[PDB]
Design a protein around this ligand. Sequence first.
Ligand SMILES: C[C@](O)(COc1ccc(C#N)cc1)C(=O)Nc1ccc(C#N)c(I)c1
Length: 247
Amino acid sequence: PIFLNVLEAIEPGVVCAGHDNNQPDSFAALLSSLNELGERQLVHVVKWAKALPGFRNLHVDDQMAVIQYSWMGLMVFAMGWRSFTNVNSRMLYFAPDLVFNEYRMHKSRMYSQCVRMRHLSQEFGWLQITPQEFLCMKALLLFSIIPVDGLKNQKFFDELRMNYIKELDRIIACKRKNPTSCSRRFYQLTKLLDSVQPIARELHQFTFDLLIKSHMVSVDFPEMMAEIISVQVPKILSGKVKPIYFH
Ligand SMILES: C[C@](O)(COc1ccc(C#N)cc1)C(=O)Nc1ccc(C#N)c(I)c1
């Protein structure tokens, strides 16, 4: 289980937001914690991505671009699984110190996005996603969004993405002698992966608008995040960078 040992080995641990839960909920505070949390998780997404099998093959510039484009989606996917395993989808488990109930979802002004993630959370349970399918799907998620004008080394990217899809096939086939059974499972999983993109898009859109009016809502955007929202996020929203759907 070489490939799976590695994913299990590099999976990031618990990341906290540093939120003040003794303080009454407020839009400004909730968003500042989401921003800080986002930034803390990105530190780990980079380290995780760099230790992924084959990731170093990519051109240095494609490595940073791919990580930044996939950032939101990766957090969404990982948060849904935590929400499912920790609180059986009753609340969104952004972090141990940042759990959203409907009241928080509503005050964050990202209710529709939150409800969609809760649904994703429920999907992990309904589809009985195993920890291993989760780890592979998550890694594959990192290789699911590219520029129309291509990466510096598109070919190396295509090879890598193909190899990860082949790993998922193996995880699905393992203990499934029935081809039909493997096909239906692959269908279910690629469908779940595709559902992540639309959610990341709404969060992207929301975050973009929020930054532009940041000075009007007292929200504190971290340096790195502000730069990525203004430089990378617009390419996605304008259609220059697109996610790779299966369906
Ligand atoms: C509102 C915002 O702070 C915006 O953060 C980002 C993150 C990535 C990009 C990009 N590219 C833009 C904003 C946010 O959605 N944060 C956030 C933090 C943690 C999780 C988890 N788990 C999630 I889903 C979202």
